[PDB]
């Protein structure tokens, strides 16, 4: 039951992946002219052929589909910070999230697609490009519903109360501290993802100034080693990222 | 409107939590005993006081709670493992998941927290003291709604089909990768996790045999690491985790 | 041709070492009492026996037995730091170092074996508790032919020059980066080793202040991963030592 | 008193290094022409200009320029492996060591640096024009008194006795522990450098054969990270090389 503007994911031969809108259109590829219409009236599993007879398999987009594809600027969080920062707050589905800046909406993405079609995710974002960009990849992963992006600055105060989790990735999140400890609910959680140690030592010092207000913060940082595994030879891939940035938490209360 | 037989965290001054059922009855603690039916009618946030005026304050348990008091086995997979399953394979609401084996249910109450209630875990376990164990855990959860526990031998087959990720902490996945083939939907995620590179490099074997069934296979592994940060002096944490498992992620068709 | 008074390594039927003084005495082990007059005119590779019949096998001490089995404080830079040290400065035999605080004698040991009988190391030091410890360790080790202790703040001043290297392990190396400058010869190191990232960034802003002095500086630290290595699983071990301090070095003129 | 013929290191107002030969010849430069006949009579610490008016300051060349410049093939054991080889095999002054295969000589010009000119290391090479690349290498260094390259297959034999080390790059490691065990002497050391984990595993069960021969072998890995250290933050760099080879020690008798 694939219908006319609904997306798929089509897979080359060397199993690249296209997120496509489907259409009555020409698809132009590497491998060939796709003739889209085709897509029309199949299943997913199923198979189309370019007009040199290459085969492109249909899949229904998924989350990793969606976040391997978007539209990015230079700075986003990495998914293996996004799955930390989801694992140790506990972020769960019909959850409320406060986050901000938005950028390109990476972490919005993931997030929204945790906390479900019941939770909600409010962005703070103060550049209007950055903004317009964010929305753009979160009507196009299917999320409009349950995000919403502001053009306000989240320094000046967070609107929302009782929420779960507020979220940041800000030069300055200790700015956000105060607005966060009367936003939460008992038992939420304060989490900022920061690149650079000077900026995880002037949170920490706001932190402890709050102390009455959170539990004991916890700052981590973490590296994915990718394996290369061959018939004869296992071992590391030589060249890793190994820093993007420290995510500190706080618990409320 | 916390009512008895509800489940609460309460926190000790030094930050300590106790997940706890309330009833009217006395608990006795490190800061001495708390009379229980004094939580009745109130609300998180609140507090209780031992009664040696020691101030214990009431939240609403979250996942984090439950992992972290969970009855446990020695061999879990730790939550910084499961965040990588998660992210990398896209667990999604909704999800429905093939398990094995539950061992002491740590894995199964990471999953059944984020595919929510109306996505499903089924989890094959051939000891039935650990399928016990698990069983215990994950009522205690409140997910019995949604994970079931067989006791059955996973190498023997997979009853489930269109499932959306078979999801592997057994000594041997290799003999489930034709069983997750067939079980699998289109672009649905088998993935394994194993301590020992012996037990990638048979794995990897095997899914190249299935080359057609799958995409190319990937091996991670994650390292978390604490930071230390006072006042005068920041620095991580002089001893780390530094392996559990390898995971190792295929992509159905 | 093995005398009295020579120092010897007896090696258990377990694998452990002994580092001994050979003298007409009564030597009490786990695995019985030696005679330790019996290795009196054996050679190197030969054994002894305990009175239980337990052999202990007879081996010259190495740098490597010096070090493990050094008197020590809680304090040492470990052989990884050491190690990294004398290969990024490229510290070679023959050359004269300038090292403080002593300490234990642990990095001074490392040292004065890597520059020879005719290098020299001068070790700075202001407890006079620590000054004797590393002094005996340096005798016990064979090295105070080429090592001297002085009891005196660095802080306040180098008296040598044309030296090769100026190597660190003091609260505030910073306060020593001036004096280095004059001492050092051209092409000369100063390395710094210090636990906090606090202190690399005032050594840093030292070394921009000296930016004329020194070239470009280069900040690491090193993390060494043991493997399990079994016949039927290889893995790194769990945990690791993942952080001692980072070391900073600076190329004179 | 530095003459014609002698080797100099230039350095660059950027900070570049260039190893050079003095002689009364022309030197192009990114900045300009040197006339390198200017830099006889001078002294260490003194500079040159060139005709666009740049400076080049001049430093003796030490062991660190030699390793740096050196013309390699794709393959060398990095400084910080041979680093970790010369720390915990105790590598010191006067050893003898064989090593095989030569290379590049990397790992030769470091460990012939740290032997001296009384210690020797003889390298075994099968590919003659390596074994000229090596040699090159070595004669430029001011090494070739110390170091013998021999065009032999050390799988066959080992010709040397009483070696304190033996020292391996090579695809088979295995095939040379019997050899070592008869040439190492008492308290030697045999050490191996693998990419593979493969190659450790078959390493690891030659040596389990010969268990009468070795006390317990052990393998590690080093990785070292590079921090960026700048006015307003402080963090590792984005990427590292993670991953070189393992290295296994085993110590004889
Ligand atoms: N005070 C503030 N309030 C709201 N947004 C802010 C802010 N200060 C900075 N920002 C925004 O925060 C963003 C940091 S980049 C955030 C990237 C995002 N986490 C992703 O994964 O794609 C920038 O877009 C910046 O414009
Ligand atoms: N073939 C098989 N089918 C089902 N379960 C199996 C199995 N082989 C081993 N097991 C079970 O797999 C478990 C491995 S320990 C699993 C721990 C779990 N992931 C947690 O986080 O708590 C053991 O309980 C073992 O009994
Ligand atoms: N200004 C100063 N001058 C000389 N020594 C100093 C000093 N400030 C601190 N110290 C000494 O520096 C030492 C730091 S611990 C050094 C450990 C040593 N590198 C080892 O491996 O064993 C202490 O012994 C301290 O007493
Ligand atoms: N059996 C053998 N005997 C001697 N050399 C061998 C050998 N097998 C392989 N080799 C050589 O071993 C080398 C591996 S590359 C060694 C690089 C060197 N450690 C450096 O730092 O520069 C190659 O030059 C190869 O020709």
Same mark, same amino acid.
């Given at each position: 039951?694939?219908?006319? #503007?609904?997306? @798929? @994911?089509?897979?080359?031969?060397? #199993?690249?992946?296209?997120?496509?809108? @489907?259409?009555?259109?020409?698809? %132009?590829?590497?491998?060939?002219?796709?003739?889209?219409?085709?897509?029309?009236?199949?299943?997913?599993?199923? &198979?189309?052929?370019? %007009?040199?007879? %290459? +085969?492109?398999?249909?899949?229904?987009?998924?989350?990793?589909?969606?976040?391997?594809?978007?539209?990015?600027? =230079?700075?986003?969080? %990495?998914?293996?910070? &996004?799955?930390?920062?989801?694992?140790?707050? #506990?972020?769960?589905?019909?959850?409320?999230?406060?986050?901000?800046?938005?950028?390109? *909406?990476?972490?919005?993405?993931?997030?929204?697609?945790?906390?479900? =079609? +019941? *939770?909600?995710?409010?962005?703070?974002?103060?550049? +209007?490009?950055?903004?317009?960009?964010?929305?753009?990849?979160?009507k196009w992963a299917g999320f409009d519903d349950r995000v919403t992006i502001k053009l306000k600055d989240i320094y000046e105060g967070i609107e929302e109360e009782n929420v779960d989790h507020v979220i940041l990735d800000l030069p300055q999140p200790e700015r956000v501290v105060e607005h966060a400890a009367k936003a939460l609910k008992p038992g939420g959680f304060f989490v900022a993802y920061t690149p650079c140690s000077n900026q995880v030592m002037r949170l920490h010092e706001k932190l402890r100034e709050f102390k009455d207000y959170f539990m004991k913060p916890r700052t981590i940082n973490v590296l994915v080693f990718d394996q290369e595994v061959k018939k004869e030879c296992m071992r590391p891939r030589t060249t890793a990222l190994v820093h993007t940035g420290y995510i500190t938490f706080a618990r409320r209360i």
């Open positions: 039951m694939i219908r006319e #503007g609904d997306k @798929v @994911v089509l897979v080359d031969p060397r #199993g690249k992946r296209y997120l496509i809108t @489907v259409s009555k259109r020409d698809f %132009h590829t590497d491998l060939g002219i796709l003739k889209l219409e085709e897509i029309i009236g199949r299943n997913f599993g199923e &198979a189309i052929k370019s %007009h040199k007879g %290459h +085969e492109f398999k249909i899949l229904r987009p998924r989350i990793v589909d969606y976040l391997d594809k978007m539209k990015r600027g =230079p700075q986003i969080v %990495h998914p293996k910070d &996004a799955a930390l920062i989801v694992a140790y707050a #506990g972020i769960s589905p019909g959850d409320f999230i406060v986050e901000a800046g938005v950028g390109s *909406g990476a972490l919005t993405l993931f997030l929204a697609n945790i906390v479900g =079609p +019941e *939770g909600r995710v409010v962005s703070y974002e103060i550049r +209007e490009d950055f903004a317009k960009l964010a929305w753009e990849n979160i």
